[PDB]
Design a protein around this motif. Sequence first.
Motif, PDB file in Angstrom:
ATOM      1  N   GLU A 150       0.863  -1.109  -0.125  1.00  0.00           N
ATOM      2  CA  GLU A 150       0.160  -0.477   0.155  1.00  0.00           C
ATOM      3  C   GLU A 150       0.910   0.843   0.079  1.00  0.00           C
ATOM      4  O   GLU A 150       1.781   1.486   0.122  1.00  0.00           O
ATOM      5  CB  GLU A 150      -0.763  -0.527   0.829  1.00  0.00           C
ATOM      6  N   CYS A 204       1.737   5.047   0.894  1.00  0.00           N
ATOM      7  CA  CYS A 204       1.459   6.252   2.069  1.00  0.00           C
ATOM      8  C   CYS A 204       1.763   7.510   0.773  1.00  0.00           C
ATOM      9  O   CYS A 204       3.099   7.505   1.214  1.00  0.00           O
ATOM     10  CB  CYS A 204       2.689   5.905   3.079  1.00  0.00           C
ATOM     11  N   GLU A 247       7.863  10.323   3.302  1.00  0.00           N
ATOM     12  CA  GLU A 247       9.116   9.676   4.612  1.00  0.00           C
ATOM     13  C   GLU A 247       8.668  10.828   5.952  1.00  0.00           C
ATOM     14  O   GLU A 247       8.037  11.997   5.835  1.00  0.00           O
ATOM     15  CB  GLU A 247      10.331  10.012   4.535  1.00  0.00           C
ATOM     16  N   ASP A 267       7.478  -0.383   5.436  1.00  0.00           N
ATOM     17  CA  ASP A 267       8.383  -1.807   4.839  1.00  0.00           C
ATOM     18  C   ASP A 267       9.013  -1.995   5.926  1.00  0.00           C
ATOM     19  O   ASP A 267      10.512  -1.641   5.570  1.00  0.00           O
ATOM     20  CB  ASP A 267       8.640  -2.515   3.537  1.00  0.00           C
ATOM     21  N   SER A 310      14.070  -1.118   6.171  1.00  0.00           N
ATOM     22  CA  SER A 310      14.435  -0.442   7.291  1.00  0.00           C
ATOM     23  C   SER A 310      15.176  -0.951   7.900  1.00  0.00           C
ATOM     24  O   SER A 310      16.659  -1.505   6.874  1.00  0.00           O
ATOM     25  CB  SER A 310      13.286  -0.409   8.290  1.00  0.00           C
TER      26      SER A 310
END
Length: 258
Positions: A87, A89, A93, A151, A155
């Motif tokens: 999905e 965003c 960030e 995700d 990261s």
Amino acid sequence: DYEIQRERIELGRCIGEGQFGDVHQGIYMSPENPALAVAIKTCKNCTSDSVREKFLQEALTMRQFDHPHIVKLIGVITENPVWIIMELCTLGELRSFLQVRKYSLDLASLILYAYQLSTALAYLESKRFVHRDIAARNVLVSSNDCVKLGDFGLSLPIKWMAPESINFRRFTSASDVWMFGVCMWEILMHGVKPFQGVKNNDVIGRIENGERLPMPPNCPPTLYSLMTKCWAYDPSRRPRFTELKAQLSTILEEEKLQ
Ligand SMILES: COc1ccccc1Nc1ncc(Cl)c(Nc2ccc(N3CCC(N4CCCCC4)CC3)c3c2C(=O)N(C)C3)n1
């Protein structure tokens, strides 16, 4: 059934880079039904089979989780080039957002973000999943009133790590709490990084000396008290994520009142 037809996917501009390839934004199309905004993880060297199984294990990880404040897996495309569809965003960030909207974000919105994330982290705690990489760089913005952990695949973050993780590579939920503490600081600081100009080696000696990140200007006393509790050297004195959730809830309500 997470297998997606490639023809349902439209690739768009590049939004970042992972260890396996570029991340793109795009559209997932469906008969009826508009059009869903998605993140598309790609894979440069998914030619080999070892790389493919490493890349897809990331999809598998996200599939284990179903939470409003954690990015959802939409599906996978398992022919070459192999794609993971997450999905989107849309707002990006958290760090860039806080720096840019520095003057249109009230203290109430920053606390909301810290709370939302803590609900997500309480969920991961109750599942006994240790994130290990909680930092603002890793938080994404869906809308003005909605942040989500990105995700996990995308990261050592010495300046974010708990002492026992640095010294003894022990990564646990109490070490995540410390990392979350650092993250709440970043948020309140509108996207400024911890220990600017300080080399990664200087970090640990200072943490053992007792030095903790300063109270951000305008940060409400009770919230910084909570941050300092996240940075209890002994990790058993640090509050659990469910404790943080209930404190950030009352703190936030208090500020929604001003
Ligand atoms: C418009 O949609 C965008 C645009 C730019 C970034 C993110 C974004 N929305 C996303 N929505 C869902 C997902 Cl899964 C996603 N994936 C990421 C897409 C990009 C990132 N970035 C990590 C920080 C990177 N950058 C930030 C500052 C300059 C150097 C390092 C570049 C962007 C991350 C992502 C992620 O999950 N994590 C944990 C970090 N991005």
